[PDB]
Design a protein around this ligand. Structure first.
Ligand SMILES: O=C(C[C@@H](Cc1ccc2ccccc2c1)n1cc([C@@H]2COCCN2C(=O)c2ccc(F)c(F)c2)nn1)NO
Ligand SMILES: O=C(C[C@@H](Cc1ccc2ccccc2c1)n1cc([C@@H]2COCCN2C(=O)c2ccc(F)c(F)c2)nn1)NO
Ligand SMILES: [Zn+2]
Ligand SMILES: [Zn+2]
Lengths: 957, 958
């Protein structure tokens, strides 16, 4: 019909509950396309996936493909304004991102549904005519270097790269993929390579239309969308690039039966078991690797984890197939270690091979596979509706692996047991194909090797043949037994009819001294799911560091207890979250509205009648100790945000305070704590989903009755239900707090301009200003001045107060970062006042679109309401009224607000700054303003005592 | 050569015997007109003082005009012939750092003041005219009768006043003892109008009949020499006329035979259970050198091992006992044994009384004990040798009364020193304590409904019965009871009075000699008083003493139970001049130990050990918890203005549990729960202590460590983190805001009001603005709101301080409704604006000097110096030089400064006016111009009120 379209796909199989419309098609230049018509979406979205990545970097230029990824954002022949893409999105309620994996570079964006074409055009140019400006190239090499830096001291990256460096050095799998200033600038300048030539050369060589897939979602009809995609993308040139293949596995036989001992930054104890296996991607219909992962990584009774845990050796286990690349994959079993586990790695692994041996003895189990098939099938039928941005990027990635008519289902459905493949894979899980790595600080000083890129300290030795042989003779262990039929599988998918007095927003359907119960029957999504949210308030949860530690340990121990029972439910789409908070306990139950009452009652009963297992208590406590210490190894901007949260809140226990109180938690004391915690409570709950008002009251009643019967719960007094306030800073004050990060050699800074108490006017002043400065902020402080990879501006909301905040992680000292943010603000004063009235209104509309974007799945709407409820404001219609006020704000309103609240000279300026100094650190351009002397906070307690405390917000109703 | 006799002086006494530690100089003498005079010269005193006690009181009321003595007492303040401005006397004192008071007992009317030492004579001259030329202005008399009515109304629903007059009403109705002494509007106006009495003549008649110089004792204390004090007193008081009035006597007891062997059943206002046993006895006053009454009071009322109380408490029948002689009047006394009653006790009154008579029998069996007398003598002797130095106002008032009862040379010692062992007198008094002489009274709500009589002045509901002769006979036949042993030698009697020498490194103010996670020790070796005494103060912080109502209740009961079990052990120390206080706070616990330093470390160790290792007796636990339940409930019967202040503290503090919340929580306090709470509270602590007195730095550090070591060994205490040491903040009120909180008092038929004008955090600046303003208005506010408008008896102005914040407050209890009182206070503030503007610069500087004198009045005794520091310490301001600093700054203020302050913070149209009012309604609820007031925001809920406002900072330490 049309010459630009090679073929047009037929029905793209979808879920019957999926109301979006789909058309597949393949362009003449080979670009695989999927088109999603959703006339309701408030944001439209496109994504493109190029099937090339880090594995295809030049050997002399580590990280080229990643770098190119960054550079495409900085201008094209048709749109050469460096920040034109990001600025257009920001002015039209959009955003975008991209990532570079081993075989993919993936770019995506969303934007106000009324601006798809303008965004998509600019987006298309990335793949037609990028500038690769020399100036922009020399700047953005720093963002890559800063990105690598944040990862250098991160234990997950260090290991990630160290695996690669213990395989065959000649294999692309060993490449350093992120790149840094050395590999992208310094070594190429020393070696005479022109970097810009190489970006152009790579782009022209590999960004070919035959290796691309594109997904576009908008309100427009599938037809209009077909015309729009052909317009912009058939232009792409096809250079018929062959899809790279890695048939040879990176681990050959000299890399097997090897043992690696590794010393990470954090105090952690891990055991990693790896088996090389053939590439299983083709078998995807059956999925042998997933069947095996399901059993090995089972956490229920008779499981491998179960026994390793009751032997006191392991707490968590992960098992299944791990991606490698077209040509090779891995099977892994990864456990963390107790102190005992670390002494018993030989036996832990023996136990591993014992469970594999039982899976060999029983042979494949068709009922197991069939159970997975029918659950996945139900999962797919009732899948929540995705957000555009992630949906397009996801699908754009898999289009390369499946035909058009099955791209939506290929990754949820399964087709036949195919026990031959299961046996084939299982045959690779043998002692002679094993690689073993142990991570413990106990190897400190006992290593002899250094990994080039990250510096990781490790040792390599061969597994003694005697030990391989013992593992080969693994007997059957009577403690291991296959799973039982999942008893939590849901069976009643009936959607209850809307009650005649249903409400659009949650209604307060119960209000005793015990309970406040908020209820809404789902009237948007009509899936057989419910969300049950409970806030258990008790003053004894946070009264002091000792009690705060005991709340944590109680819930951790409780969940550890429930794990075996609740794993099945989690597999059958029924999950729960149990969390301690500064006001008490948070419990969430989400999933199929069928079996929920079984799980909920089991949890409340186990809470109220818990019996602590002393060995579990010792093991989890020790873990918690290490947890607290390991915060030292977090990142500087993390540390910064933490200190700021400590400074600005009435009450807050530090890690050191908690860590000192921990030694005083004893099993008796914990046992006494729990009934005391439970003795008096107030329960605030949101119940939202496929449930009637009667059902909601009965769930609430069951919770109350179980607590009253088993723990004798009495209500709290109204006067005891107090929330913490935020420190009220003085007009024209500027406080600075200084700490050192002893692990990372970058610094961090958070800067907080506290404005005033939340209210419709103050909320929208702040939100509008943040919107107007959002893109400029990123462009000026990252893109132009390249302060660091992490640069963030936005609102801060805490305890009913709010303000503006800047967060930055950099190698520059924080006081420099201060002047640069101050300089930026001034230049923003000029920019807002030079800003046209038409631009101003573009920003108003962008914010409105964001605020009024409607929630696409039950959980999202639920969390919107929970935010209103826990925050004690209860303004469920907030978006309408606040957007309405928004639309009436003038550019002068915003200028008055800035000069009153934010400007260096503002009369009501309220500035506090946290500075985190790097490890080795010390205690033209637009001109920075002159800054007052900061009052230096030496003691958080003294700081807080000398200031007032804000009020608390008044509820709405 | 014989002397040149001054004729105004009938005689000059010999050496007035005094404590060898007492540096004041004394002279006694009797005027020609028979006034007995003691002169006290004290060249260091910052305030001087005088008092006059007339030996006439309300037993001599005219029979048809109840309360005339008392009323006359009020009227003498309101103007004399030489000083006829109604409030000259009050005004003069106020402007010269002075105050005065007076009171009317059955046989005495006692008047006293205390002002700046430079203005003795001026004060004394205005004072003297009271006894020469009262005006008894007819308008004044019509107004002041309201004050007396409001005083009586204050007392009407008070169980102690009800009982006091009920006793008078159950004796011989024709005896003066049965008179009603307060008076009220009926007996002092209404009835005298119906009966055609001219009250102003009756006043003049009484004053002239009885204010005779021969019934008068005066005491004057001043910086002036003894000779100059003599000339002065002769000058001002010689002209008081001697009508040679005979001193009234009452030789017939008010309780005759038909008033004995009686039982009375009385209904209280509060929920209380008391037993009152009374025996009539002869007038023992004349035997003061042996004190047979107090010997028997000492034994019968003893609280140590083997005691009467001891057994009654083990039976679980009583919790407290009081026994000894009770004053009556010249010619009769009583001997009492009073106990409170448990629930069981109320059912075993007959056995309680039998046990009382068994102990009395043990005393008859053993007979008088010279060694006991010996103990009494020795303790009293030591007490007098090392008597603290008194505030002059109280001292002149006390001595002026007792000049009537003792030779001049003995006024100081008569009440302390024992000289004569009189076993005959002991046996005499003991023979009067017999069932055929006994009167028994029971006070319990359980008689509610079952009474048939009504006491006429208070309304008391009671029934009267004759004690069955079979009961009297069982008490007569009280055989001995082996649980009752006499006390043993008091091993807490101090013997080491040595005053350690003043260390080289010693400091004028307390020094921080220890600062650890556990403890912060303040110390000062005494450098002023040099008595063998010390004060040891400890604040224990725990977040678990006030975390919620339940825990608060448990902190209370813990310390109540603890004090209960230490009582027998600690009683001997109490008698030996060594006492302790233990009481829960909103931050944890407070412990004070005061007295002769000798044996303190023993008592303190016993207290701390018993805290850390406490074993709760289930039976004491039940009894004390029940009493505590009653105590909460009984709050409903406090005065209206007390409620107003209570509610204000509730409203203006961050955290604060109401009586109702405490009471609801009490039922979940179980013995096991309390046993759990104990160690939890003691597990983490911070101790801040002031140790001040006759102790060295080493001994002090040892004391502190001993308290730490004990808590550590037995309760495994660890330190709290600094971040946990949080104090509570005050609610910060909004500019131009005005909130009202309204409540009703369901017992009293008056209303109460507190009005709080918040100003700002305490600083030198703000403190002195408020204090000077409050000084300027102090006297005028009393004179306008009470003396002129007669809003009530209780009228108060002054600073309020709480949680580092401050402001101005008025408190009034009145029959009129709160909103009326608001307008009249507001009216008053306006008049004070004009008054300050019209005040001369000298009159202003005069108010400044008055406040200065008051702020720099140097403490006279160790306890008062200690208290001054302790306030600096628990307020965490640590500003030990505050008086010198703040007075310095005071002296530079100008009347413009104060008018600016008033217009900014206080005036009705002030931009930073922060007004909260508490209105307490009564059970049943021209003049200057009141401004019109904004509509007030009515607080309907304290939690929401507090949630919606900011909280102030805390004051910066020094
Ligand atoms: O490193 C990566 C991720 C890398 C990709 C990248 C690289 C270079 C860019 C240059 C200019 C604009 C966007 C560029 C984006 N990346 C994402 C972000 C975040 C997080 O997600 C959304 C964007 N974003 C922002 O911060 C942000 C916020 C507000 C703005 F107005 C704005 F323009 C950007 N930062 N860097 N892949 O390999
Ligand atoms: O009732 C009684 C006691 C009665 C004696 C009395 C009687 C009538 C008076 C008339 C005018 C002035 C003082 C009169 C005093 N009394 C004492 C007080 C309190 C507490 O002691 C100090 C005075 N005082 C004040 O409140 C007060 C406060 C500030 C002032 F500037 C001021 F002049 C007075 N109130 N009534 N005896 O039988
Ligand atoms: Zn990147
Ligand atoms: Zn009076």
């Amino acid at each position: 019909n049309n010459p630009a379209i090679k073929r047009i796909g037929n029905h793209i199989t979808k879920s019957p509950e999926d109301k979006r419309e789909y058309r597949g098609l393949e362009l003449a230049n080979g670009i695989k396309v999927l088109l999603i018509s959703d006339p309701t979406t408030d944001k439209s979205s496109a994504a493109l996936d190029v099937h090339i990545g880090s594995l295809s970097d030049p050997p002399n230029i580590a990280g080229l493909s990643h770098f190119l990824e960054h550079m495409l954002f900085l201008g094209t022949k048709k749109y050469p304004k460096e920040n034109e893409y990001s600025q257009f999105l920001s002015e039209h309620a959009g955003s975008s991102n991209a990532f570079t994996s081993g075989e993919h570079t993936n770019y995506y964006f969303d934007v106000s549904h009324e601006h798809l074409e303008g965004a998509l055009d600019r987006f298309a140019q990335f793949f037609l005519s990028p500038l690769f400006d020399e100036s922009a190239k020399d700047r953005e090499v720093n963002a890559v270097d800063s990105e690598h830096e944040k990862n250098v001291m991160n234990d997950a990256w260090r290991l990630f790269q160290l695996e690669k460096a213990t395989g065959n050095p000649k294999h692309p799998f060993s490449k350093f993929g992120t790149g840094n200033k050395y590999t992208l600038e310094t070594r190429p300048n020393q070696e005479g390579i022109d970097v810009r030539q190489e970006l152009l050369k790579f782009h022209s060589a590999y960004y070919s239309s035959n290796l691309m897939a594109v997904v576009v979602l908008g309100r427009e009809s599938l037809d209009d969308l077909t015309n729009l995609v052909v317009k912009l993308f058939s232009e792409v040139e096809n250079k018929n690039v062959p899809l790279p293949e890695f048939p040879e596995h990176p681990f050959q036989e000299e890399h097997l039966k090897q043992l690696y001992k590794i010393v990470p930054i954090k105090d952690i104890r891990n055991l990693y078991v790896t088996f090389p296996i053939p590439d299983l991607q083709k078998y995807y219909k059956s999925n042998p690797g997933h069947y095996l992962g399901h059993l090995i990584g089972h956490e229920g009774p008779g499981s491998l984890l179960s026994e390793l845990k009751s032997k006191g050796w392991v707490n968590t286990l992960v098992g299944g197939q791990k991606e490698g690349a077209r040509g090779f994959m891995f099977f892994i079993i990864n456990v963390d270690l107790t102190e005992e586990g670390l002494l018993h790695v030989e036996d832990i692994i023996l136990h591993m091979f014992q469970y594999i041996q039982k899976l060999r003895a029983e042979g494949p189990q068709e009922w197991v596979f069939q159970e997975l098939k029918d659950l996945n099938a139900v999962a797919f039928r009732f899948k929540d509706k995705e957000r555009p941005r992630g949906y397009t990027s996801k699908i754009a990635g898999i289009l390369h692996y499946y035909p058009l008519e099955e791209v939506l289902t290929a990754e949820y459905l399964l087709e036949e047991f195919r026990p031959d493949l299961i046996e084939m894979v299982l045959d690779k899980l043998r002692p002679e194909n094993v690689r073993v790595a142990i991570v413990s600080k106990s190897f400190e000083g006992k290593t002899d090797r250094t990994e080039e890129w990250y510096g990781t300290q490790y040792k390599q030795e061969a597994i003694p043949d005697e030990v391989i042989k013992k593992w080969q003779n693994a007997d059957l262990n009577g403690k291991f037994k296959l799973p039982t039929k999942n008893e939590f599988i849901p069976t009643n998918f009936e959607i209850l009819p809307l009650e005649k007095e249903a409400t659009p927003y949650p209604a307060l359907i119960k209000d005793t001294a015990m309970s406040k119960l908020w209820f809404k029957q789902d009237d948007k999504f009509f899936l057989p799911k419910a969300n049950l949210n409970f806030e258990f308030f008790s003053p004894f949860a946070y009264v002091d560091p000792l009690h705060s530690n005991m709340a944590y340990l109680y819930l951790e121990l409780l969940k550890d207890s429930l794990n075996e029972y609740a794993y099945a439910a989690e597999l059958a789409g029924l999950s729960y979250d149990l969390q301690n908070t500064i006001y008490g306990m948070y419990l969430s139950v989400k999933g199929y509205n069928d079996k929920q009452p079984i799980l909920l009652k089991k949890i409340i009963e186990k809470m109220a009648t818990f019996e602590i297992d002393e060995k579990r208590f010792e093991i989890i406590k020790e873990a918690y100790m290490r947890s607290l210490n390991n915060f030292r190894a977090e990142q500087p901007h993390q540390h910064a945000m933490y200190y700021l949260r400590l400074l600005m809140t009435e009450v807050a226990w530090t890690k050191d305070e908690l860590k000192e109180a921990l030694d005083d938690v004893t099993l008796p004391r914990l046992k006494a704590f729990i009934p005391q915690l439970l003795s008096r409570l107030h329960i605030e709950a949101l119940l939202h989903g496929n449930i009637t008002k009667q059902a909601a009251l009965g769930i609430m009643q069951m919770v109350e009755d179980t607590l009253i019967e088993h723990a004798h719960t009495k209500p709290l007094l109204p006067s005891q239900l107090v929330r913490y306030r935020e420190v009220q800073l003085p007009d024209r004050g500027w406080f600075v707090y200084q700490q050192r990060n002893e692990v990372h050699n970058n610094s961090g800074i958070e800067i907080y301009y506290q404005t005033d108490m939340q209210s419709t006017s103050e909320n929208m002043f702040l939100e509008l200003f943040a919107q107007i400065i959002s893109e400029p902020a990123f462009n000026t402080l990252r893109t132009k001045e390249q302060l660091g990879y992490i640069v963030f501006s936005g609102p801060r909301r805490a305890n009913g107060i709010q303000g503006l905040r800047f967060i930055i992680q950099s190698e520059k000292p924080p006081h420099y970062l201060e002047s640069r943010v101050e300089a930026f603000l001034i230049t923003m004063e000029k920019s807002i006042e030079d800003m046209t009235e038409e631009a101003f209104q573009k920003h108003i509309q962008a914010l409105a679109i964001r605020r009024l974007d409607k929630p696409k799945k039950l959980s999202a709407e639920s969390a919107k309401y929970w935010g209103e409820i826990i925050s004690q404001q209860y303004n469920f219609d907030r978006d309408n009224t606040e957007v309405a006020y928004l639309k009436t704000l003038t550019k002068e309103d915003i200028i008055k607000f800035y000069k009153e609240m934010l400007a260096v000279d503002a009369p009501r300026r309220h500035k506090v700054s946290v500075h985190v100094l790097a490890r080795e650190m010390d205690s033209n351009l637009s001109q920075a303003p002159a800054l007052p002397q900061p009052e230096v906070i030496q003691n958080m307690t003294e700081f807080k005592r000398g200031l007032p405390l804000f009020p608390l917000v008044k509820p709405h109703i």
